[model samples]
Target chain A: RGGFVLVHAGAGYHSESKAKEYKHVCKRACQKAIEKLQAGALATDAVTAALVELEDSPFTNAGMGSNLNLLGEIECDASIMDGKSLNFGAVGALSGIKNPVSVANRLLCEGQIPPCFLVGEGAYRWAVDHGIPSCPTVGAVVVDHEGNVAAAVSSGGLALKHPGRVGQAALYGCGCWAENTGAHNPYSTAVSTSGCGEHLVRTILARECSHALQAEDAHQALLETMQNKFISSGVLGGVIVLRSCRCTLLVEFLWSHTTESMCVGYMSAQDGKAKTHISRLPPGAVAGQSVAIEGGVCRLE
Target chain B: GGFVLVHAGAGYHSESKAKEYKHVCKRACQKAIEKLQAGALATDAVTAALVELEDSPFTNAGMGSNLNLLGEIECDASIMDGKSLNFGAVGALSGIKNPVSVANRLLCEGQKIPPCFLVGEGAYRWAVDHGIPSCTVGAVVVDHEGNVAAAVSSGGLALKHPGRVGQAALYGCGCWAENTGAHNPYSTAVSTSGCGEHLVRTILARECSHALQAEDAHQALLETMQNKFISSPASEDGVLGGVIVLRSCRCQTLLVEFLWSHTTESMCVGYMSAQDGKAKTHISRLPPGAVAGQSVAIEGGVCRLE
Candidate 1:
């Protein structure tokens, strides 16, 4: 089975013209993940590279173009999870760095007993000591050649967020999660989420989605969880889920914003196809609200 | 049943100091019940109790909070409102006296949009402008009636990296509470303390309470702590912390239960139940020996009232 990749910027009010920039970035991110996956890079490394690309893009609400904090400064947060090792790392309310996800990436590489989740000034200092830079608000999930799953996410907090406000991006089991069983187990999945940090954290959206995959009902699980568990409860957010079972993966990039439309761009390595959509995922999956993208769609059960 | 419960912190804490920990825990419990008795919201009661523990230097929070690697005090705190699902938090914070109050003010007064989860200098400024004072940290707290909530704070770990937030500031990690509505009516709130690093990895506060789906909230919490968190192969060495739960499961009686479990040498607890014959507050210890074990005694009905 081949690998798969998906990435998204933040979900918020986005214009048609900006959609072009998002499409290009999403495609580029997929290309990056494919290159790494094909070259035998670990899923963790591949996803990190893809997220770095999104963070570097000035078009997105992360990294260079990130929304300013209350103090007009850019304090970013990011996290990465390695499904193979079940290891996780994150940096929150971090400043002065250009690639916060890189800090989280390097952090996961360490042998720290507790699985490094540093924040604020301490996280910045660790980044400096390790010569790492920072950024925010993008995510990528990859299943590498080795059947390993990895996921990552970064963000600049809510627009005009208070300083030192860490969002779901850097919180474990909130914005990001990944896990796989190779050579033994049957379950494998990776997920990254966006929008409404507080809501995402409260519901632990990413982890919940991965858990739902255990039933092998990807689309219905995503739809019901987003509707009943999240949106029905008054929390607005979105998720990009990549789950592999029985040698095939069905990736669903869905968004449901109660108040505003979420802007998302996604691509898969299977066909190198890409698309951008700005809409609230209606409660029903096959309903009128679903965005249409041809060619590279994964065959679903 | 309705109840109130609290903890100081959890870990390899040795004997000889058990009496002191118990005393501190008692003071915290008594302080919290005062608010609950007056019909204070459970969220408010949770904060009041944590403020006591944080004020104590003998505890890991507030005045006696540990120093960071920078040799300075950097604290973190957060509070959640189960009824409204509102939340507030501060990270790597300092200058303010009680960080939890600042977080509460954020919940009550900060920008309605992003809420107020400010950090460092910026968070301190917001606290100053809002007239919120500062203080120390450690906790898991729950109060009377049906509402459930939790708060946590820490001076941070000794020689720990600067701006390293413990369970105190992370929403689901430090504390969490949810009321599932009248149909099923299973509401739960949880707070945790011990190794910040280990706690974050396990997401203890949220996981433990979710496991309260068990028949008895007390046994559910004990088993979750012993089997999932402390004994997990992924956990680090000497992983010790206390978990406190405020739960209501049976739909019939409207009775609320307070439960706590710990893997540390000793866990501090103080509770008051309307059912107690004396109607008096009592400070107690769990698993008297304080020895680490594969199986733990479920500290049940510490505080129960109808």
Candidate 2:
């Protein structure tokens, strides 16, 4: 009977004064997720609850406040993965939708399209035909009572991106991942990542982190992946991970970035709290800085 | 040492048309190797081969690509470099004579565009502005020294919705190539053809190479096709596709371990190792035989480990 959810507005330039609003939005988003989880919702649905709330936040660079492309239009990408079903759905370069994450979620439930990756006008038509609203966003990762994990991510893409450019947010393994390989070797894990799309896609960061979770200590796995793989590659990004070993549920949250600032929030299903931690790239943290939270205590590594 | 491979497409090809498919595949492979032999980059060589394949009305790429539900021709293409990890692609494009080449040009030295993927009017305009011929596209490759690169193209599925993108333009989905120095000692490159939707969903091109991370090259390809993917929902729904893989040894031995496999009813492949001085072509049909799709490569080095 354990579950948790984590969310991020994004890893980009954020002013110090905006921290209050950003924290409030993240706090409310976590509340949405915890509310769903407490009501005995599945991990997939609970994660969606968090994403929908995050997308609705005007302070975030998603949904109504999404960044414009070269054409000054908002084309978004999003994906959702169901750990229990090993099922995935996504939409890329989608337009005219209020909530791209929800469209991705619906695609996950639609049995007609296998694998469920759709793009461009075709994807937009499917959403319209199905009467799905559009919303853009960053990400969320969830674990449920049954030890099933689900991960999802969404984005308006890099600010002022080239027209028709699809980022890692819609790519499987790059933006998000969740799996409970059922005691095959080590642990069940879920992950969601944000940052430079190109670097994330090159490393398939989320999936790589999930693979690292095969280690006995989930916390150490996250550390090694972020340090050796991400930081060493000169990539500016952030990530959240949830791990379950044998019968014990362990959630480890961490974020790193070479960028000036990153905003993130976390709350367990049990805590019923909405608190966020912001990482401002320090003075000469050349290799970048890393931060972790355990039992709601934040530490910079 | 240098090598090039070619594939037409993977689909339900009637047994009666085997001869036509074989001829087309052989010609495409020959064109690709000729380019590589002339000192062209693997990126350019692959573009040349795909241009040839696309020109043929018989194949389902370029001029003969399947029309979307709007009954129009929309094409997708991409090219990748092993050395720089630089990539470029276009989706839902039209009025291009050689999309593969256009994609290559986008990855050219002078262009510094941040976002590598372009689409629709913007992509077509970029092609025109750069003086690239707009045309309808397979794939091509090369292995010189320890560097390997690849490019692939497709018109997508027949009756797909407008603005539909096939695997061709999706990075790490349609085609990918990396060198030994990039990640693993046995660096790899890959290109795919077959059901567009299935390819997009599975990200088969990249996943196939990832499969090699833990197993033998031959076994990796076989298992990915026969065991892991065959049981996937897309496979159960009768999706068919093929893959070609190029693996190089630890930058010293200069070995090339290249293989092609498919799950479709027919796949036409052509191969020419530079050391062999001869070309071989095959049309594989399933009765539980090899997956149908062709892969052609000519390598001028020993494929043995030190």
Candidate 3:
């Protein structure tokens, strides 16, 4: 009946001068999600709360201080997946929104035949038209008390990207994925991603990582995927993976990055404070060709 | 039985040029059937079919693709193979005569560290460097082995942003093909043509292909179009698109069913099998008394391939 939350600021070069801020933001994000889970919130709601905190952090390249597009304007992309419902929602190349993830969550919550994705001015207009508040690449993955899984990602997109260019965050099977097929199912995985949008989109890094988690050795599966799919392409990326088995109540939390450094945080309902760290490649190791993978296990009773 | 279906587009095809549109669809189907007869894989056959469609001056792809803002031609194309679940796509690319071929190449070159999706100047440069050649339309195929493949291409909305990508270039938006063996017992392939933004929002092609898994594909597709698309908030302004679906199920026999549905004024579609001497073409329109965007036209038939 215990819940767990994991979040990442992004996968990129986090200079030593600002490492404290980066780590702090991630810890705060995790704390926000854990608070929600302790309040009897579902996985999806917890993920949204975590992302909001991350997006509000000016230190991250998402919501508040997101990178600008070619016209020196902010164009954000975000997406959310509800593993329980197997439904997804996303927005790409959207602008003028304060928090893009909220809009994505709104789309996911639509009762009728809601759209799974929307882009460009249309996405912005849809958010405004629906009276939804606006909203970054900050993401979270959670497994709630009921064993439900969920993933969400938000990004300001690549700095100076083409006017209408979309990133991995808004693409299905690219940004985030979560699924808990059944109580009897052995694997329930959730994944959130960050880093070069194009590289991530090309490899569908998030979904690929989630799929790999189905393997008996989650760490080895992630290593193989990143080595073959990411490092080989000489692209940088980071992923936060959560795997749980309903029958076993076995939880595994992992973070891997092909970038110089990736700031991440994690906490469980029983933890009093969030734990944060900035994972980094070995000294003198190249960013794209080298990777850092780390994780811990949580056994829920 | 090997089968193929192709569509020119889902928008309003002028009555004066209905014959031209129908002719193009027939040709596209014929091209694919020819490849299938020659023992090509479903993915290759689908690519061949799209090349034919894109080559036609009448279709809104490749040769006569709509121009983007600043008076230039940029195209988007993607292809997926059900067997491997591999996908390749190029978006906002220019100077390619057949964009589908580039998309096909991307799918074939997947021994990559190379990317699956490339866009804008990067997409164009990648194609040129890779010795590749460029729609708002697509094709779906089921080969003799029950392998399914789907491909789509588009010129994008007229006068749109130079780097705007349509549904054709997106994953799970323009086309989807999947073969689930005994676990699901059905292999479905789907291609879509319509307002790129609307289609992208709904992930229509993938949704339709998934819908085909139901015992009654016909009713499932109707609900998908009505609920997942037409009635969705994304299409509130009036949905404008069409879909072609091919479901191959092995139940005592190979039953290959093909269906096309549209919410536009008219949609031109063609279908054929190796057993058929010629392709059958039709320009399906909303019911006589029905209004575009308010009504849909769904039609299809089943083929028992030996």
Query: Which of candidates 1 and 3 is the stronger one according to DockQ?
Result: 1
DockQ value of candidate 2: 0.38
Residues A1-301, model 3: lDDT tens digits: 4688999998898699888988888888888888888788778778988898898888888888999866798877888998876678887767788888888888777646333565665567678878976552789999987678999999987887655566788888889999885543468899999885567875668877887888899999999998977876368888899998755577899999989999899988876778899888999999888889999988665
Point to the candidate with the largest DockQ. Answer: 1
In the range A13-92, model 1's lDDT, one tens digit per residue, is: 54677777777787788888778876777888888888888988887766777888777888888999999788888888
DockQ of all models, two decimals each: 0.54, 0.38, 0.11
True-structure RMSD for candidate 2: 4.5
Question: A1-301 in candidate 2: lDDT tens per residue?
Answer: 4567778877766587887777777777788887887788878788878787777777676666778887799887788888877678877778888888888888777765356666777788888888886444468887776667898887888777866777888877788888876544365678888775577876778888888878766667777887778766546677777766443454555554555666777877666566687767666554345533232322111
User: Which residue ranges in model 1 land beyond 4 Å of their true spot?
Assistant: A133-136, A182-185, A247-301, B110-116, B134-144, B180-184, B234-238, B249-254, B274-297, B302-306
Q: Candidate 3 at residue A239, lDDT?
A: 89
| Candidate 2 structure quality by residue, lDDT tens digits, B1-306 | 466667776667677776776777677777777777777777777777778887877777778878889888888888887767778788888888667777888787424536677777667776787787654235545455666777788888788766656578777778888766545666778888766465435567778767866546776677677643455442345356777777776545566777777667757776665544466767755665344332211121225432
List, residue by residue over B11-84, the lDDT tens digit for candidate 1. 55546665666677677766666777777776677788777877776777777778887778887888887767
Give per-residue lDDT, candidate 3, residue A132. Answer: 72
Which portions of model 2 show Cα errors greater than 4 Å? Answer: A134-137, A183-186, A246-250, A281-283, A287-301, B109-113, B135-140, B196-203, B210-216, B231-239, B250-253, B274-277, B288-306
Q: Write the per-residue lDDT of candidate 3 for residues B33-60, one digit (tens) a residue.
A: 8898998888899999999898888788
- Displacement of residue A278 (Cα, Å) in model 1 is 6.7
Worst 10 residues of 2 chain B by lDDT: B293-302
